[PDB]
Design a protein around this nucleic acid. Structure first.
Ligand SMILES: [Mg+2]
Ligand SMILES: [Mg+2]
Ligand SMILES: [Mg+2]
Ligand SMILES: [Mg+2]
Ligand SMILES: [Mg+2]
Ligand SMILES: [Mg+2]
Ligand SMILES: [Mg+2]
Ligand SMILES: [Mg+2]
Ligand SMILES: [Mg+2]
Ligand SMILES: [Mg+2]
Ligand SMILES: [Mg+2]
Ligand SMILES: [Mg+2]
Ligand SMILES: [Mg+2]
Ligand SMILES: [Mg+2]
Ligand SMILES: [Mg+2]
Ligand SMILES: [Mg+2]
Ligand SMILES: [Mg+2]
Ligand SMILES: [Mg+2]
Ligand SMILES: [Mg+2]
Ligand SMILES: [Mg+2]
Ligand SMILES: [Mg+2]
Ligand SMILES: [Mg+2]
Ligand SMILES: [Mg+2]
Ligand SMILES: [Mg+2]
Ligand SMILES: [Mg+2]
Ligand SMILES: [Mg+2]
Ligand SMILES: [Mg+2]
Ligand SMILES: [Mg+2]
Ligand SMILES: [Mg+2]
Ligand SMILES: [Mg+2]
Ligand SMILES: [Mg+2]
Ligand SMILES: [Mg+2]
Ligand SMILES: [Mg+2]
Ligand SMILES: [Mg+2]
Ligand SMILES: [Mg+2]
Ligand SMILES: [Mg+2]
Ligand SMILES: [Mg+2]
Ligand SMILES: [Mg+2]
Ligand SMILES: [Mg+2]
Ligand SMILES: [Mg+2]
Ligand SMILES: [Mg+2]
Ligand SMILES: [Mg+2]
Ligand SMILES: [Mg+2]
Ligand SMILES: [Mg+2]
Ligand SMILES: [Mg+2]
Ligand SMILES: [Mg+2]
Ligand SMILES: [Mg+2]
Ligand SMILES: [Mg+2]
Ligand SMILES: [Mg+2]
Ligand SMILES: [Mg+2]
Ligand SMILES: [Mg+2]
Ligand SMILES: [Mg+2]
Ligand SMILES: [Mg+2]
Ligand SMILES: [Mg+2]
Ligand SMILES: [Mg+2]
Ligand SMILES: [Mg+2]
Ligand SMILES: [Mg+2]
Ligand SMILES: [Mg+2]
Ligand SMILES: [Mg+2]
Ligand SMILES: [Mg+2]
Ligand SMILES: [Mg+2]
Ligand SMILES: [Mg+2]
Ligand SMILES: [Mg+2]
Ligand SMILES: [Mg+2]
Ligand SMILES: [Mg+2]
Ligand SMILES: [Mg+2]
Ligand SMILES: [Mg+2]
Ligand SMILES: [Mg+2]
Ligand SMILES: [Mg+2]
Ligand SMILES: [Mg+2]
Ligand SMILES: [Mg+2]
Ligand SMILES: [Mg+2]
Ligand SMILES: [Mg+2]
Ligand SMILES: [Mg+2]
Ligand SMILES: [Mg+2]
Ligand SMILES: [Mg+2]
Ligand SMILES: [Mg+2]
Ligand SMILES: [Mg+2]
Ligand SMILES: [Mg+2]
Ligand SMILES: [Mg+2]
Ligand SMILES: [Mg+2]
Ligand SMILES: [Mg+2]
Ligand SMILES: [Mg+2]
Ligand SMILES: [Mg+2]
Ligand SMILES: [Mg+2]
Ligand SMILES: [Mg+2]
Ligand SMILES: [Mg+2]
Ligand SMILES: [Mg+2]
Ligand SMILES: [Mg+2]
Ligand SMILES: [Mg+2]
Ligand SMILES: [Mg+2]
Ligand SMILES: [Mg+2]
Ligand SMILES: [Mg+2]
Ligand SMILES: [Mg+2]
Ligand SMILES: [Mg+2]
Ligand SMILES: [Mg+2]
Ligand SMILES: [Mg+2]
Ligand SMILES: [Mg+2]
Ligand SMILES: [Mg+2]
Ligand SMILES: [Mg+2]
Ligand SMILES: [Mg+2]
Ligand SMILES: [Mg+2]
Ligand SMILES: [Mg+2]
Ligand SMILES: [Mg+2]
Ligand SMILES: [Mg+2]
Ligand SMILES: [Mg+2]
Lengths: 134, 77, 96, 101
RNA sequence: GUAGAGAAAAUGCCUCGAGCCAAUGUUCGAGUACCAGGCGCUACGGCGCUGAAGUAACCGAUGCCAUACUCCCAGGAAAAGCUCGAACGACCUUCAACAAAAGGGUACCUGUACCCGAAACCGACACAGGUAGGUAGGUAGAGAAUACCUAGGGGCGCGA
RNA sequence: AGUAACGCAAACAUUGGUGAGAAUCCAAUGCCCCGAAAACCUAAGGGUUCCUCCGCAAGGUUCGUCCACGGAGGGUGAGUCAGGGCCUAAGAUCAGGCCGAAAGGCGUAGUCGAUGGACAACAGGUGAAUAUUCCUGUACUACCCCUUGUUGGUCCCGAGG
RNA sequence: GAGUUGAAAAUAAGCAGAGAUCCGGAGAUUCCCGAAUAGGUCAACCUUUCGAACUUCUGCUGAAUCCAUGGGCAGGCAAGAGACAACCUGGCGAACUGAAACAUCUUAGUAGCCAGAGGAAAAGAAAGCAAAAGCGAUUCCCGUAGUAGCGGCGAGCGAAAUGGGAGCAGCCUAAACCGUGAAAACGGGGUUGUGGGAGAGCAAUACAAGCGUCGUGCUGCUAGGCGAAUCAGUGGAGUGCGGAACCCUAGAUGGUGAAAGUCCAGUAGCCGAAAGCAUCACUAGCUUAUGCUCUGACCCGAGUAGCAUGGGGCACGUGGAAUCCCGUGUGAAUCAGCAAGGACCACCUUGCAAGGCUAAAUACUCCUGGGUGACCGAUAGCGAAGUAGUACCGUGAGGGA
């Protein structure tokens, strides 16, 4: 499968080298580049080696699956393919605008993310607990 | 080895030359003897190999001076 | 005279690695009342006899070791005639 | 929060208690190894939990020994000693429940 | 048994002993073992069931006694276990050690498959070759030669 | 050049079977060859080639349903058999010791070193692949345990063997 | 600061905002082989009375032999031992080759081999250069100079002083003498050269300078964080094109479906260290210290210098052959001396051998971190962009895709 040189880069201690990227899992984003350009969605899975994200209704690909179990029954399934994290911008549903993202400090002793075209804060205090229970 | 303990002499590396000028590797050796020497302060002999210059120096300065400069204990000898 | 040194220094809890369950072993249980255990290579017979005699609380007749071509010691433990094999078979989860 | 708890618990015990504890744990580890091969359902996570628990225990043990002022060589001698005197006892955990049954 | 510095030994003197040796043989082991056949099933591969007689003579080893003899010159390993034993030295000592005939108990590692007059080792090959040792049936034959056979194994990895 | 060759002049034959496919794989019946081996076993070596199920790309001088080939899963059980826990030969290393520009060379006690000394097990059965190893019979070594009998035993040393 | 349990999916279970996985500092564990080190061995095993063998260390014990030596016993986290590309020092030390042959000479004190230590090593504080004028330890670069010379006067080899730079740094000890002993030792004194010190008297005394546990200090390194500015159209995808905008203490770089200052990670700029490391300052303390006069009687590194021989090395091949260093043998002088100044002698000048130690400038790349490249782009670049020192070949050293 994997082209032998396209495998995961490594540190001396054998662990893969992760790209640090600007988005988390529960986020809503809009897609700037690609054929999926303009569409809005929310993020499902994220791979921190390739730096690629997967979004539920976007980048659908038609995959043939052969299930041979005592009969021959095939399936035509539509899956979602990863799309590069640098093709998406964080989207504000409220003023309905996609922006870049800065960091800011909250008086709680906290560090969070905000959109710089509004000043709307992104991260909610229980966000992780909101997604874990899903 | 061919060495004197006391004066620390070495064999010396020297050419034998001919009348025809043709040089040759050769060794000149320390003149060594197996001597018993008298040690007065131990009231006894000591068996050694010695250069003869050592023997001289032992006549001149006494055995203990020589051995102490050379760091060799006459008891362990 | 002195403390009895065990042939090597091992840690007994690691020596019996596992029961070997295949068609072969099970009928050895049936016939011979003998369990089959993959054990540490560095481990001996006296150590296996104490280990299993204390662990499952059974008196053991005789032990026979083996070394696979893969370097993994394999031990036949044939128990006494008193303690049935199939007993320990249901106790361990080996089902004849 | 289990790690911190368990360590506080550990650092407060005595030496003999630690030893004994260690032994019991290693035995449970054994019985676990038996279940794996028996193909009786169990928890993969358990090997990790236990093995690492043992780690933590030994760590603490050696750490105290360092304060006592003992070297590597003395350590390893007393270790051969203690591994010599080890006798297997059946794991209190699951073997005692087949002694009762 | 004695004698010499002399326990045992060696050596010298005295004494007691007619038997001794060892393959093999008899008996137990050993029979409700094994086995010709017989009965029944056939997944027709193999299987369950019951079992008669089980002695004698003549050939005869290169094997055994056997380092047994006889002869020869070229004159044919060491050390431990083993048997015996005072002085010297060291260490250990009483329910401790040693000595015995029964009885019960107890049981260290490593090899172990397969091939090995070879398609598996050694020859670059699934190569007309090399490779220590053991076992040695029948008829003819002086014979381990030869010819034809048993047990067992094969019909040579291109055919027509 | 679709040429030489296909590795002895022991020899194959037919009927079935499996299979998409058989001169070549399986079985039966004949015939033929070896039989001081072309038989059975063990040393060394090889290293999983052994057994079962699947496969037929490459390997196999043709074929191929087959294989010492490829894939998966198994298989080697010892107080007595062979080595080690015993002893030494040739030879090796060699404390101290002797010598040597250095590395090292010689060499004593010691310690290694079997192809030799010492030392205890056989019959039958099971058996996809192990058996003097597993099972049933009778055995035998070495330790420990008790009873009894003695009081010194152990090593170093002296000897017979 | 959010998801995670290597490459590496899948499955099974966990661990996780009371902070996981992850990154950095300090510790812990570390089977068996290997210096290998309890004894043995056919490396990765065996046997064991469980032992770091042996050599140094501390203690107890005490052969032949009185003191001793040797040996025995014990203590001890116990000093060493091994590994290490090139560079370096020391030891052994070639030959092909050049000379159009070859032997002196050259190659070359090169390679190789052995031993040794360091981040550099070695050398180094004038018994030195020079020439009648002067310098002021060593090393390295430029130059003098292919000059003086050496040489079967053939092949060839080949300086130095003046001059310019880099870089700078000077110190301990022996002896006379005074203390303690029977010694051998220990303690003070004492270290220099157009002479010093010991000896005998009289003055000055406080600053200066050098070394350094402990510790907040300063800085840097080892994790990090904050970080400006864009939209739509164009045929798979736009960073390109046409058209509009903006940032810049940031237009380094890598990625992104297609070439991006403005999409991502970043860059400038600016913040950050509980722990360890490093250079620096400070740091109690420890060190030292001057001045003059008289005295040729006392010292100033002995089997040494030199001499005779045999060599070696110095650019210098025995030459008129100094200086330097060694075998054999002889063998001085102490400052009214001794050595050097290219045989040797006189005179003058310069210096003080036979005891040590010392940083920098210089050499190097198995490497680490940054940077650049008129460097390669799968026959190239490392032998190796996949099992690469692998497969395979060789008894082995070794070869090697
Ligand atoms: Mg692919
Ligand atoms: Mg079996
Ligand atoms: Mg182990
Ligand atoms: Mg075995
Ligand atoms: Mg006698
Ligand atoms: Mg007598
Ligand atoms: Mg007699
Ligand atoms: Mg007869
Ligand atoms: Mg004969
Ligand atoms: Mg024969
Ligand atoms: Mg005879
Ligand atoms: Mg006695
Ligand atoms: Mg007796
Ligand atoms: Mg077998
Ligand atoms: Mg066999
Ligand atoms: Mg063939
Ligand atoms: Mg052949
Ligand atoms: Mg053959
Ligand atoms: Mg015959
Ligand atoms: Mg005839
Ligand atoms: Mg006949
Ligand atoms: Mg014949
Ligand atoms: Mg036949
Ligand atoms: Mg034909
Ligand atoms: Mg052609
Ligand atoms: Mg033709
Ligand atoms: Mg023709
Ligand atoms: Mg033809
Ligand atoms: Mg041919
Ligand atoms: Mg053929
Ligand atoms: Mg025939
Ligand atoms: Mg055959
Ligand atoms: Mg066979
Ligand atoms: Mg064999
Ligand atoms: Mg294979
Ligand atoms: Mg087969
Ligand atoms: Mg094929
Ligand atoms: Mg074919
Ligand atoms: Mg078929
Ligand atoms: Mg196969
Ligand atoms: Mg010998
Ligand atoms: Mg030797
Ligand atoms: Mg020696
Ligand atoms: Mg010897
Ligand atoms: Mg041996
Ligand atoms: Mg033998
Ligand atoms: Mg035997
Ligand atoms: Mg034996
Ligand atoms: Mg077989
Ligand atoms: Mg049998
Ligand atoms: Mg048996
Ligand atoms: Mg029987
Ligand atoms: Mg017996
Ligand atoms: Mg004897
Ligand atoms: Mg580690
Ligand atoms: Mg060892
Ligand atoms: Mg060794
Ligand atoms: Mg004493
Ligand atoms: Mg005495
Ligand atoms: Mg002594
Ligand atoms: Mg000691
Ligand atoms: Mg070293
Ligand atoms: Mg070395
Ligand atoms: Mg080093
Ligand atoms: Mg020449
Ligand atoms: Mg020549
Ligand atoms: Mg020439
Ligand atoms: Mg020429
Ligand atoms: Mg430097
Ligand atoms: Mg130096
Ligand atoms: Mg100076
Ligand atoms: Mg000076
Ligand atoms: Mg200059
Ligand atoms: Mg300057
Ligand atoms: Mg200067
Ligand atoms: Mg002083
Ligand atoms: Mg002067
Ligand atoms: Mg003067
Ligand atoms: Mg004075
Ligand atoms: Mg940022
Ligand atoms: Mg930005
Ligand atoms: Mg655009
Ligand atoms: Mg544009
Ligand atoms: Mg993009
Ligand atoms: Mg894109
Ligand atoms: Mg760019
Ligand atoms: Mg920066
Ligand atoms: Mg004077
Ligand atoms: Mg001289
Ligand atoms: Mg003369
Ligand atoms: Mg001279
Ligand atoms: Mg010369
Ligand atoms: Mg000269
Ligand atoms: Mg001079
Ligand atoms: Mg000069
Ligand atoms: Mg001179
Ligand atoms: Mg010299
Ligand atoms: Mg003088
Ligand atoms: Mg001078
Ligand atoms: Mg002087
Ligand atoms: Mg001189
Ligand atoms: Mg000097
Ligand atoms: Mg020096
Ligand atoms: Mg290519
Ligand atoms: Mg290449
Ligand atoms: Mg190409």
């Amino acid at each position: 499968r994997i082209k032998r040189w396209e495998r995961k880069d490594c540190k001396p201690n054998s662990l893969p080298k992760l790209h640090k990227m600007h988005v988390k899992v529960g986020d809503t984003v809009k897609v700037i580049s690609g054929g999926e350009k303009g569409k809005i969605g929310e993020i499902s899975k994220i791979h921190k080696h390739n730096s690629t994200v997967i979004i539920k209704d976007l980048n659908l690909k038609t995959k043939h699956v052969k299930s041979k179990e005592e009969g021959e029954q095939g399936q035509i399934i539509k899956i979602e393919a990863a799309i590069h994290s640098s093709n998406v911008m964080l989207y504000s549903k409220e003023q309905e605008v996609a922006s870049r993202v800065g960091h800011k400090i909250l008086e709680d002793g906290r560090k969070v993310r905000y959109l710089i075209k509004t000043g709307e804060i992104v991260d909610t205090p229980d966000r992780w607990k909101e997604i874990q229970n899903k | 080895r061919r060495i004197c303990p006391f004066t620390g002499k070495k064999s010396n590396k020297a050419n034998r030359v001919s009348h025809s000028n043709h040089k040759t590797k050769r060794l000149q050796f320390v003149n060594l003897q197996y001597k018993r020497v008298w040690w007065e302060a131990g009231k006894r002999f000591v068996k050694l190999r010695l250069s003869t210059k050592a023997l001289k120096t032992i006549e001149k300065n006494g055995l203990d001076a020589v051995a102490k400069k050379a760091g060799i204990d006459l008891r362990k000898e | 005279k002195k403390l009895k040194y065990p042939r090597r220094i091992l840690d007994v809890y690691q020596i019996l690695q596992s029961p070997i369950i295949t068609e072969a072993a099970i009928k050895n249980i049936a016939d011979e009342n003998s369990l089959l255990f993959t054990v540490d290579v560095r481990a001996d017979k006296k150590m296996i006899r104490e280990a299993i005699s204390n662990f499952f609380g059974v008196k053991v007749r005789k032990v026979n070791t083996l070394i696979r071509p893969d370097g993994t010691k394999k031990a036949y433990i044939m128990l006494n005639k008193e303690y049935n094999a199939s007993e320990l078979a249901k106790k361990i989860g080996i089902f004849p | 929060v289990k790690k911190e708890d368990e360590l506080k618990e550990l650092r407060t015990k005595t030496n003999e208690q630690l030893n004994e504890e260690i032994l019991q744990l290693k035995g449970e580890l054994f019985m676990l190894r038996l279940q794996r091969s028996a193909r009786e359902n169990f928890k993969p996570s358990d090997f990790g939990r236990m093995r690492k628990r043992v780690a933590r225990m030994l760590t603490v043990k050696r750490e105290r020994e360092i304060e006592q002022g003992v070297g590597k060589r003395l350590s390893r001698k007393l270790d051969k000693a203690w591994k010599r005197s080890i006798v297997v006892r059946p794991p209190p955990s699951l073997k005692k429940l087949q002694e009762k049954a």
